[model samples]
Target: EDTCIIRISVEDNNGNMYKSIMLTSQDKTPAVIQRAMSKHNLESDPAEEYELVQVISEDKELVIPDSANVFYAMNSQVNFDFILRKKN
Candidate 1:
């Protein structure tokens, strides 16, 4: 599979935000979360779980299915923005 560059943005409830360009076409959601979190200097506690969501409209965000391929699911041309939130 060929890889392409896509922008990824992650944010938490506490207003922490991180952004980076990621190579896609073969990555999964879990890997995306880990990369974004690590890039932002955010560490997750073992006691809590994390989730990734796609921002749709102003009041809509769709959770990324864990088993889905990040690039295939997004079908993005330029950037794939996501939100990293605690699964509480």
Candidate 2:
């Protein structure tokens, strides 16, 4: 038998809202995301960046990228945008 626990943390800024959900299960996380993607016929893309290399190296921003993402939204009214960027 298998079980899963999901936890959600939400923060709202004025009218804007921030919500995050976490899932803990005996099953693997990647497998779950893959299954959800397949069921919805979704696609994902990898992130890219420019680099500089020389005798003296340059500063690089601390950035972590994800290749695949699954998204879902509720309600029939309202528009949302998913944007990813590092905070300076």
Candidate 3:
């Protein structure tokens, strides 16, 4: 089965944190970020204005590619935090 689901806490620049959000394996990174924004009332901004990133450390954060399916691309079997933020 292509059934794979993941749960993570999604945060944004405005101190918005959506905890334990679930997504399917096929959910693309941009679409996931778009949904997060919509939930936080940040939908006014387009998806292209944001990027999905993993804040691994203060010095280095991993930016996931827009073309990747988030559930498949991220190696977080454990619960983690996903940052949906504007491009720097």
Point out where model 2 deviates above 4 Å.
5-24, 44-88
Top of the candidates by TM-score: 1
**Per-residue lDDT of candidate 2, residues 1-88 (tens digit):** 2222321111112344222224432221234333333343433211232211111113321222231221221211112122222222
Q: Please give the CA lDDT of all the candidate structures.
A: 0.52, 0.24, 0.47
Per-residue accuracy of model 1 over 20-82 as CA lDDT, tens digit each: 465746654556656666666665421246556665444545564463553455454344556
At residue 52, give the lDDT of candidate 2: 11
lDDT of 1 at 17: 50
Q: How high a TM-score does candidate 2 get?
A: 0.24
Clashes of 3: 0
Better of 1 and 2 by TM-score: 1
Residue 61 deviation, candidate 2, in Å? 21
lDDT of 3 by residue, 1-88 (tens): 3444332234444564553354444654556555655555653232454456654444544465464653345443333355555554
Better of 2 and 3 by TM-score: 3
